[PDB]
């Protein structure tokens, strides 16, 4: 997929770096930090529908992230015939 998984970490970092865009993230800005990593309120997207979730509630799965809805219809119950 992507040939470039070399460490070569940096001396130090005083800011939460992003994973989607790979751009340093700040506080004032709306983002989603989970277990360290942090995705900009706009970067944080779904894995199924692929829709910017952002601050909005979500459901992180094994090597993926399902937004509330997706998880609401995927796992959680719901009226199929509305």
Task: Name the site residues for Zn ion (rule: CB under 5 A).
Answer: 18, 20-21, 40, 43, 46, 48-49, 67, 70
How many CA atoms, within 13 angstroms, populate the side-chain half-sphere of residue 15? 13
42's tokens: 């706009």
* CB 8 to Zn ion: min, Å: 21
Query: Smallest distance, Å, CB 35 to Zn ion?
Result: 16
Which parts of 8-63 are beta strand (E)?
Answer: 31-33, 38-40, 58-61
Minimal distance, residue 3 CB to Zn ion, in Å: 22
Nearer to Zn ion, 6 or 29 (CB): 29
What is the phi-psi region of residue 75: left when phi exceeds 0, alpha when psi lies from -120 to 50, beta otherwise?
alpha
């Amino acid at each position: 997929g992507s040939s470039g998984s070399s460490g070569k970490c940096t001396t130090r970092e005083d800011s939460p770096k992003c994973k989607g865009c790979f751009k340093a993230i700040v506080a004032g800005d709306q983002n989603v930090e989970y277990k360290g990593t942090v995705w900009h309120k706009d970067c944080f997207t779904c894995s199924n529908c692929k829709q910017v979730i952002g601050t909005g509630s979500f459901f992180p799965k094994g090597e993926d992230f399902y937004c509330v809805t997706c998880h609401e219809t995927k796992f959680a119950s719901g009226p199929s015939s509305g």
